[PDB]
Amino acid sequence: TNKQVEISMAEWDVMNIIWDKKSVSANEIVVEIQKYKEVSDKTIRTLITRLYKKEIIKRYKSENIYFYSSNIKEDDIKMKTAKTFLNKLYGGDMKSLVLNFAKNEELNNKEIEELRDILNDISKK
């Protein structure tokens, strides 16, 4: 038995990379994340170490280098995070959140329609 599966806000950047590349080396994660923000190799490795310790990822040695892989279902931890978020910011109501989106004009009719599409597509049995 265990508890709360945790992913600090800054940790998602590491996990999204681990989930996206299935099996990766710290160095890899490090270069990938730098491709879009100023972060030190050490900092990222701390995140890596921390995830590894919370057991959200596992590893094995390949050459003499460590390669990491997810030890948690992505769809599940993101979904749990999202409900938390939705409850706190909208009393868990996708409507209330999709409506706050249109309102603040964070969506152009092109995206509004693509959505309405896919979404109409889901209702379709």
Add this chain to the structure above:
Amino acid sequence: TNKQVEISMAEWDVMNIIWDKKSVSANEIVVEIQKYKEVSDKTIRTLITRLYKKEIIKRYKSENIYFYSSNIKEDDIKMKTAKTFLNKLYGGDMKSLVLNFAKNEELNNKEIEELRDILNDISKK
């Protein structure tokens, strides 16, 4: 000039109450929040104090009691939080998040249709 407007995860419970009741007393916030979880008067007041200090709320004295009110646009801070969330968990793609919802079966066709509705309703000019 100033910076980052902050609302710790536990703070939203206080703000949602301040935004919902327009002008409130700490005591009020305290009873309201207890109506759904075990939290001490002091704890909640700390949140209140902290928000007040970050200037996300202001106050005036009424009888000799303090009444607080929002000093920030709700639609704006929630929206900023949501983009942050969406970028981190879905590379900012409402589709990708609405699809993760249906998938994990966090939505019954009733809600799926209400959504598709309102949403189809938004595309409607």
Add this chain to the structure above:
DNA sequence: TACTACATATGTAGTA
């Protein structure tokens, strides 16, 4: 790669 360091934050709550 493994530990350690560390200012700031966070969730809880106690003293003045």
Add this chain to the structure above:
DNA sequence: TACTACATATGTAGTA
């Protein structure tokens, strides 16, 4: 109501 206390966490990063 105002401060203080405090374990744990968090984002950054340095030493072994």
